RNA sequence: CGUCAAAGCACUUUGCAAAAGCUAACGUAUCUGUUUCUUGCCUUUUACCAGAAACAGCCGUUUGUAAGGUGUGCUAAUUUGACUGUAUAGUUUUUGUAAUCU
């Protein structure tokens, strides 16, 4: 809650002493809680959603090493249709006990 | 302003954005046996969800991990 | 190659984002959606193996199960507000059900037509009377209906019979004409322009 | 006084409606070296 | 150093991100909108109070201008629409309808004529009564942002493509681009004299362009870094000065920069908690207009 | 007619009325039509030379009427809204 | 619901699909006495797996077939024998094949966010894909 | 006989109708009564 | 005939099938064009005279311009506090952490 | 019915706010509780008796407004509001007793 609206070549803003040599790693960093600084933001949900759905996507390509694919829009439609090829199908309503039995999102693969 | 509480990253999950829960006096400190909340979050998919275990008076006196009952120096 | 393929990428992220933040049905990011109404299997199948709780299969919801007792009076008030009148044989109540069976709130208020009731209810009192009148032995229902140690009735084997008949006056065919078609409904004209609406 | 008295009071008072207050909040957080090892890269949580 | 009764004062409001704030023209009001489909009028000097609340707008307000006459208030809205908002009395005068998608940017003339763009890749000029596009020009791809010249015959749309078009009104010839910019183009911004353009994009390059008839090349005056944008894609607004001297620009990272329109930093002040959406200074006196998506907006010196 | 409405309104007191001749009259209405023929007392005529002449009792026809000057404290009288079927401005109460 | 020998014989087309509608009631009455082998939640899957089923068979009598008339179609919905609200989700592009209201609404989540099976299965992992919790569902999404 | 006095309109249903722990569904009123004389036989066993 | 309601209590001059000229405010008219005039001034030949409360015939009228024109927010939820800026120790957007 | 104007409209879910101003049914219906008094029955408390005053609670109602849902539309449907709303060359105004000069 600095209160002078100040220019910006006087921000470097330094500690001015000997450099304590005493000190260890773990109080080199500045914290509220016992781990670490946390701090409020204001970030839109849709933006955190998707660049955490990348970080995880990403974490499971190093983990499984299968990180072979590239993304576009016709890309979209050709990556579902091997799944869907490799999907049985679904069957017909009003068939109800086996022989092409109507299962819809619930069949297998 | 009772923001967040004190985990490891060992057991924070290996990903930079972790979502999790909490529910104020949920559960009673194991050492404080206080009125503490609980966080739950997810250390990584295809695993239970973790979950503190004590209060933020205690691992402030012990200078330990409130999930994995680790101290966060050694 | 390049520019037409960067653009339009670049113009699919941009356009994606406007669709996030100024969704046609979108509040923050999410489509908004009603609370709608499970199958009533559901709650069947809920209260037929939560049964009377001698389970462990079932002991974290204790609690909860024991912490509905505050609210039981309501639903209590809300159940005998709702009780089928005379002339009709079932009614069909908007229910509203704790997720572990716990408690069970009829969600409904009994809004008739105030005309039409006291109307149907002078039916019921001619037809009484004639039918004390004719009947000749009269055997009162007993009480308490069910034995002691009873178990409570299966709903299962509820849902087969018949559900026989009620009260219900012989209304004219050619004298009684206005009311004939929706005299002993519950909601008698909801679905015309002699109501608003449901 | 009068802010200090009226927020005790509040609290006091507020001890049966049902609580509907459900919004996220987004924090970011900064690890500090615990273990040794390389710290960590900074975290934004829900 | 001015009449604010406190250097800094942190304004309080709204229940979603703001996305847009203008100072009045005379100096004394300005108005805030956002997320929340709702603008309010504010008091620069005195119990810095609301007034007014400007309600009915059906979508978020993407952008908001002030009339000369300082009476009369055009809000752009998501909802595709242009409302016209009576200040003194808050009445809707007129829903200007007419585009095919979000309405993302809005500017004002110095004689009744109204400009916008919007996702359908089309700009409209709108009469203050008319009530009907009295000229549509159509593009390829979604336009961003827009300026008018108060001289009145040169409107400067910004989109996907990168590069600034000019287009003139009556002669409908467009065969001069603004080009330097490598991503979208998030605000424009005129001069007082109507010399020179500011731009600010996504490549996170702060730009200043030059409006006169001849150049001699490189239109281009000078180039700004440091203000950098996020991967919310927000439409990020620059600022010009009364004496036309600094110019200002929001960023992502929650600070607000000032220059001095000479190539050297002078203000990067912090004091958001997230996006900077919008920043604007007092036409008389040396305050600074900050807003940003933390439902919060900030006066300055 | 608001205008028909006036000159009803003036009934009883002291209107001059010119006629297409040019002479002028002043004395006291005491009937009008909606046609405005009118009828006068005590009426001081001035033809369009000057010269003054008296009448006690008139029916000016309504067609020859140029224009009258009704007393200023008229202005204030209540002008009615009229609906389509109504023929006199009055009061309204009903839908309009 | 429930109907009685002395009510308002349904419309014309009805008798020709009571046998099936009943067969559907027979397969409830089983799956609400079958009992264990599952979690609180997962032994309640098949009630909402028939339920769509039922409903997906009438709307596939009226809208694609066409062998059955608006009237006893719209009686069909007023008695409860189908879902109005998931007929309405159907017949919306990205919908089609919704497998229940619970996995698209999203108050009933703990962050805000529809169920897993809504997600295109081109943009999930092989680890996640897995069997809904709320209905068992496998992919709901339209590509799939 | 009171005048009525002037209150925001709250409900218990509703309320409970908002949170998660609560659906609805549509039954036969003897079946609803029948659930709601065994769950409260229920609740005072699990007392007792 | 809307157009003819917008000239309510303006003030107006008339030329008339004599020749001469009234100029006062509109009070009401009529659909024969039978136009109140208040507070009228005659425009014979200039000479004035106070003329009144006038009612026109119809007939009379030839003519009307006008001379002049006709005679003659709630609250909001926002609050200010003075506040100072924070610094935060940070640089970074938003999204990336 | 007609003209003009703006609003998609009908049904419905939830949130927020308000509900006597000029003596008058938010509810043509009708319960419970607390405090302070006066009583009844009374061996002491709860539970009670029946009248008052001052307060509260619960079951409901109406309106405004915000965001949604369903069914139908935007290649029109409906609703709300406003309106100095109608014919007519044959004497009482608008299909000319005018021009001529003075
Ligand atoms: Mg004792
Ligand atoms: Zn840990
Ligand atoms: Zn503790
Ligand atoms: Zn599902
Ligand atoms: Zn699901
Ligand atoms: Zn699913």
Same mark, same amino acid.
């Given at each position: ?11 470097? &803003? ?12 773990? &109080? ?50 050709? %990556?579902?249709?091997?799944? %869907? ?17 109507? %299962? ?6 | ?18 979502? !999790? ?47 994995? !009952? ?5 | 190659?390049?520019?037409? @393929? ?63 007792? @505050? ?22 109540? @908007? ?36 039918? @004390? ?66 | ?46 | ?77 998501? +909802? ?38 919007? +996702? ?6 709108? +009469?203050?009564?008319?009530? +009907? ?169 | ?96 | ?144 | ?48 | ?97």
């Amino acid at each position: 809650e600095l209160a002078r609206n100040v220019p910006v070549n006087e921000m470097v &803003q330094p500690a001015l002493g000997p450099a304590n040599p005493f000190v260890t790693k773990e &109080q080199d960093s500045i914290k509220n809680s016992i781990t670490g600084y946390a701090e409020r933001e204001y970030v839109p949900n849709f933006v955190f959603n998707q660049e955490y759905y990348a970080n995880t996507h990403a974490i499971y390509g190093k983990r499984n090493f299968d990180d072979n694919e590239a993304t576009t829009s016709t890309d979209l439609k050709r %990556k579902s249709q091997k799944i %869907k090829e490799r999907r049985e199908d679904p069957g017909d309503p009003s068939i109800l006990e086996g022989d092409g039995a109507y %299962k819809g999102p619930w069949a297998g693969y | 302003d009772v923001e967040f509480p004190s985990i490891c990253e060992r057991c924070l999950g290996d990903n930079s954005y972790v979502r !999790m829960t909490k529910e104020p006096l949920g559960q009673e400190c194991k050492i404080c046996s206080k009125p503490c909340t609980i966080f739950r979050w997810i250390k990584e998919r295809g695993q239970k969800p973790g979950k503190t275990q004590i209060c933020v008076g205690c691992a402030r006196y012990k200078n330990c991990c409130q999930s994995c !009952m680790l101290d966060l120096q050694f | 190659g390049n520019l037409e @393929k960067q653009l339009n990428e670049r113009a699919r992220k941009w356009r994606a984002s406007q669709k996030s933040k100024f969704g046609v049905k979108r509040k923050q990011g999410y489509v908004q959606t009603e609370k709608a109404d499970l199958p009533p299997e559901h709650l069947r199948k809920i209260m037929k193996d939560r049964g009377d709780m001698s389970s462990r299969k079932f002991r974290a919801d204790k609690r909860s199960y024991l912490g509905a007792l @505050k609210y039981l009076p309501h639903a209590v008030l809300k159940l005998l507000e709702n009780m089928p009148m005379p002339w009709e044989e079932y009614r069909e109540v @908007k229910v509203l059900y704790h997720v572990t069976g716990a408690i069970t709130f009829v969600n409904e208020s009994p809004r008739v037509i105030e005309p039409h009731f006291i109307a149907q209810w002078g039916t019921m009192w001619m037809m009484m009377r004639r039918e @004390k009148r004719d009947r000749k032995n009269f055997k009162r229902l007993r009480f308490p209906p069910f034995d002691d140690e009873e178990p409570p009735f299966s709903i299962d084997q509820l849902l087969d019979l018949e559900p026989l008949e009620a009260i219900r006056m012989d209304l004219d065919e050619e004298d009684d004409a206005p009311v004939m078609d929706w005299f002993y409904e519950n909601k008698a004209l909801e679905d015309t322009p002699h109501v608003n609406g449901p | 006084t009068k802010l200090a008295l009226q927020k005790i009071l509040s609290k006091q008072i507020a001890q049966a409606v049902v609580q509907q207050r459900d919004d996220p909040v987004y924090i970011r957080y900064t690890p500090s070296n615990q273990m040794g090892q390389a710290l960590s890269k900074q975290r934004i949580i829900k | 150093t001015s009449d604010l009764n406190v250097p800094n004062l942190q304004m309080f409001g709204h229940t979603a991100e703001v996305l847009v704030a203008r100072f009045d023209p005379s100096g004394s009001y300005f108005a805030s909108g956002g997320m929340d489909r709702q603008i309010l009028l504010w008091n620069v000097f005195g119990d810095v109070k609301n007034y007014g609340v400007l309600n009915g707008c059906k979508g978020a307000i993407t952008d908001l201008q002030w009339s000369r006459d300082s009476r009369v208030v055009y809000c752009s809205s998501s +909802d595709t629409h242009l409302m016209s908002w009576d200040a003194v009395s808050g009445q809707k005068i007129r829903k200007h309808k007419g585009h095919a998608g979000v309405v993302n940017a809005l500017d004002v003339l110095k004689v009744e004529l109204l400009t916008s763009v919007s +996702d359908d890749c089309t700009m409209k000029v709108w +009469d203050s009564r008319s009530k +009907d596009c009295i000229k549509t020009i159509e593009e390829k791809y979604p336009l961003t942002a827009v300026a008018i010249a108060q001289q009145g015959t040169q409107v400067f749309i910004g989109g996907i493509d990168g590069a600034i078009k000019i287009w003139d009104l009556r002669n409908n010839h467009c065969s001069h681009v603004l080009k330097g910019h490598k991503d979208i183009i998030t605000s424009l911004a005129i001069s007082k004299d109507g010399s020179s353009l500011l731009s600010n994009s996504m490549d996170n390059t702060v730009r200043i362009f030059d409006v006169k008839p001849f150049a001699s090349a490189q239109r281009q005056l000078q180039i700004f870094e440091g203000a950098i944008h996020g991967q919310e894609h927000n439409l990020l607004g620059v600022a010009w000065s009364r004496n036309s001297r600094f110019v200002g620009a929001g960023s992502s990272d929650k600070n607000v920069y000032v220059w001095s329109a000479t190539g050297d930093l002078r203000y990067v002040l912090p004091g958001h908690e997230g996006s900077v959406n919008h920043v604007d200074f007092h036409p008389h006196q040396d305050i600074i207009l900050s807003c940003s998506s933390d439902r919060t907006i900030f006066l300055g010196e | 007619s608001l205008c028909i409405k006036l000159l009803h309104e003036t009934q009883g007191h002291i209107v001059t009325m010119e006629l297409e001749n040019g002479s002028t009259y002043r004395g006291k209405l005491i009937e009008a039509e909606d046609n405005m023929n009118c009828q006068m007392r005590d009426i001081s005529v001035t033809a369009r030379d000057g010269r003054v002449s008296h009448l006690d009792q008139v029916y000016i026809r309504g067609s020859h009427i140029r224009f009258l000057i009704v007393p200023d404290m008229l202005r204030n009288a209540p002008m009615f809204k009229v609906g389509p079927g109504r023929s006199v401005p009055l009061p309204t109460r009903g839908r309009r | 619901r429930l109907r009685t020998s002395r009510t308002k014989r349904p419309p014309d087309g009805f008798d020709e699909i009571e046998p099936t509608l009943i067969e559907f009631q027979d397969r409830m009455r089983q799956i609400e006495n079958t009992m264990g082998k599952g979690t609180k939640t997962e032994m309640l899957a098949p009630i909402f797996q028939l339920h769509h089923q039922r409903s997906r068979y009438i709307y596939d009598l009226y809208y694609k077939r066409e062998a059955i008339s608006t009237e006893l179609y719209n009686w069909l919905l007023k008695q409860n024998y189908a879902d109005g609200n998931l007929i309405a989700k159907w017949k919306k592009p990205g919908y089609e094949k919704l497998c229940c209201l619970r996995c698209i609404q999203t108050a009933e989540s703990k962050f805000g966010s529809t169920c897993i099976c809504r997600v295109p299965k081109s943009k999930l992992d092989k680890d996640q894909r897995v069997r809904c919790t709320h209905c068992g569902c496998n992919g709901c999404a339209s590509c799939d | 006989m009171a005048h009525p006095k002037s209150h925001t309109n709250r409900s218990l249903l509703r309320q409970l109708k908002n949170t998660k722990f609560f659906q609805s569904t549509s039954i036969d009123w003897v079946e609803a009564g029948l659930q709601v004389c065994r769950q409260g036989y229920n609740m005072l066993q699990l007392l007792i | 005939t809307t157009k003819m309601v917008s000239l309510l209590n303006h003030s107006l001059n008339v030329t008339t099938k004599d020749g001469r000229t009234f100029v006062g405010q509109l009070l009401a008219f009529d659909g024969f064009m039978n136009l109140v005039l208040s507070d009228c001034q005659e425009y014979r030949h200039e000479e004035k005279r106070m003329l009144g409360l006038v009612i026109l015939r119809g007939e009379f009228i030839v003519s009307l311009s006008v001379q002049g024109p006709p005679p003659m927010l709630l609250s909001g939820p926002g609050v200010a506090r003075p506040a100072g800026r924070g610094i935060p120790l940070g640089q970074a957007p938003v999204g990336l952490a």
